[PDB]
Amino acid sequence: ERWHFIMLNDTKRNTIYNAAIQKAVCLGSKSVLDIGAGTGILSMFAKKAGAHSVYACELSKTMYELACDVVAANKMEAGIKLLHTKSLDIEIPKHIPERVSLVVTETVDAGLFGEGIVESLIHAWEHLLLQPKTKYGKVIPASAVIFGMAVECAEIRRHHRVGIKDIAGIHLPTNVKFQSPAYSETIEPYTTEKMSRVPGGYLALTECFEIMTVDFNNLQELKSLATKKPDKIGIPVIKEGILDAIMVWFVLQLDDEHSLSTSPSEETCWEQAVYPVQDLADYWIKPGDHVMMEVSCQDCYLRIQSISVLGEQTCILESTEIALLNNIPYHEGFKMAMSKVLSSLTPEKLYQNILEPFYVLDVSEGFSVLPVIAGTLGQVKPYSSVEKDQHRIALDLISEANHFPKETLEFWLRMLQRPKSDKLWSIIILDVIEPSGLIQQEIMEKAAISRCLLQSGGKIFPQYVLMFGLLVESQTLLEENAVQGTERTLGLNIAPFINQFQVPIRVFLDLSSLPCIPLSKPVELLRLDLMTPYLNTSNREVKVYVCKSGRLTAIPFWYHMYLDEEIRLDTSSEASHWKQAAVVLDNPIQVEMGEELVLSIQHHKSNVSITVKQ
């Protein structure tokens, strides 16, 4: 899986875990239990350090098997007992012969507590560990400190807060309040983000501040957190700005001399816990104001709630759907493209048959306002494909706000068919690209059918799609998909086993913040034609000029969706609500400036293959 590679490659982090483990062992902790073993690297550190008995546990069947192959491969099978289990179900005598002197754990998320560290340690203290110091029990990490900072970060803003009251000719009324899932018990108490690379960056509106401290060697304290009353915190603003989120990170004290941080300020890129700020009448803050907030640990996660900045339908949307509503070119693009079709067909009906509306079908996967924009253009009968009742309500409230009479907007749901037994659609809109940066399954099929349900001059949107790509050198993508030798793992042979599992195509990327070096200019890789199924190739060669000598590790890719030949949507734009993807080469290639590289592109249904011919 994903973060195992980047963490195994972090030699310095491995060096610090090894130093701390060695110290505990050299000081008498010869009986160790590794919770969340992964490949068993920390268990091996313990054994090679001088431990007599090492036990390790892992919930994942793939990781368990992987660790067995690794540990046996490093000839440490004797002395390390791997347990395919959850730490909470480890019994005494039955699984482990006796209580241990040391527990080592690494089951930590961006918000510290999200992997159930506290529950695992309470159980470990009550049943697996020797009594604490009055031969005694100890836990690595010994303690932790959680920090926060209030920030401005429009990248976060556009995913948790709708920033416009009017878009592409339609009004979004005040009585429809949109919220993300991180609102508020709430669904996602926080998101996780690499704030070091967040597109557009971020600004600090407060100084860094301590949120809380935890002692993992203190059972009473750990048991106490479930009951602990929330902490009310008031933080002074040092900079004028738009309050977008509380950025939270932490520091692990493994022992008195060693520590790890997930601060954005580190040279290693770590995720931070991100708590969006929403549900305020004003987000503008100025020096002298205070950001107030309640902090609690009670319900399995660190929660920052009721954020104030002191100095009527609710519609919950996915962050993608919020980013969508904030993507203005997208909606301005559709408005224009729809009007151009409508005046091609029936100019009189744009603001022969007075009783016949233009029929428009939106087949978007989730929340969409394209049907309302359509309805405002002329004598149009727009159909929506939304499923959720909260979405229907919202669209009915928006229709009212935009002067529609009741039942103007239809809800198609409540397969692809004619609007009426004897009618055909003027416009059909298809969802072609996944938020992941890949092509939607079954679109060629939907485009083929839809083509049969159109009026003499009707259109499918987009009419066609171009896929683009670029040749790059990226050491980061390499580090994230494969372990780079044994030096990093302080000599242990781990890379040969974990690298059995390489990802061919990375998804959900933000190319705009990807560290890489371009080796070519963007080149067209594939063309899909939704209006004309016979024009779609299944095999294609592409000649690419290499502009820079370097090592080709990957091929990022994205799309231009043409609604018209005058109008296109870009999936890599600043406001794009789609993420991008990249083809990662398993065997990176050396390329030279002036070279002409040939790519071989195969396309079948929604699956695309890109290979270097070479």
Brief synopsis:
The chain is of the alpha/beta class and 614 residues long. Helix content is 22%, strand content 32%.
Strand content: 25-35%
Give the total of beta strands: 37
Total discrete domains: 4
Major sheet details: 7 strands, antiparallel
Shape: globular
Structural class determined from secondary elements? alpha/beta
Distance between the termini: 30 Å
Organism: Homo sapiens (Human)
Enzyme class: transferase
Catalytic activity: L-arginyl-[protein] + 2 S-adenosyl-L-methionine = N(omega),N(omega)'-dimethyl-L-arginyl-[protein] + 2 S-adenosyl-L-homocysteine + 2 H(+)
Subcellular location: Cytoplasm
Structure commentary:
The chain has 614 residues and is α/β, with parallel strands linked by helices. It has 4 domains: 1-141, no CATH class; 142-161 and 185-311, no CATH class; 162-184 and 314-462, no CATH class; 463-614, no CATH class. The protein is 22% helix and 32% strand. It is built from 14 helices and 37 strands. Strands 6, 10, 11, 12, 15, 16 and 17 form a 7-stranded antiparallel beta sheet that branches. Strands 27, 29, 31, 33, 34 and 35 form a 6-stranded antiparallel beta sheet that branches. Helix 12 links the parallel strand 25 and strand 26 (454-461). Helix 2 (11-26) crosses helix 3 (41-49) and helix 9 packs across helix 10 (370-377). The protein is globular. The two termini are 30 Å apart. This is Protein arginine N-methyltransferase 9. Keywords: Cytoplasm, Methyltransferase, Repeat, S-adenosyl-L-methionine, TPR repeat, Transferase. It catalyses: L-arginyl-[protein] + 2 S-adenosyl-L-methionine = N(omega),N(omega)'-dimethyl-L-arginyl-[protein] + 2 S-adenosyl-L-homocysteine + 2 H(+).
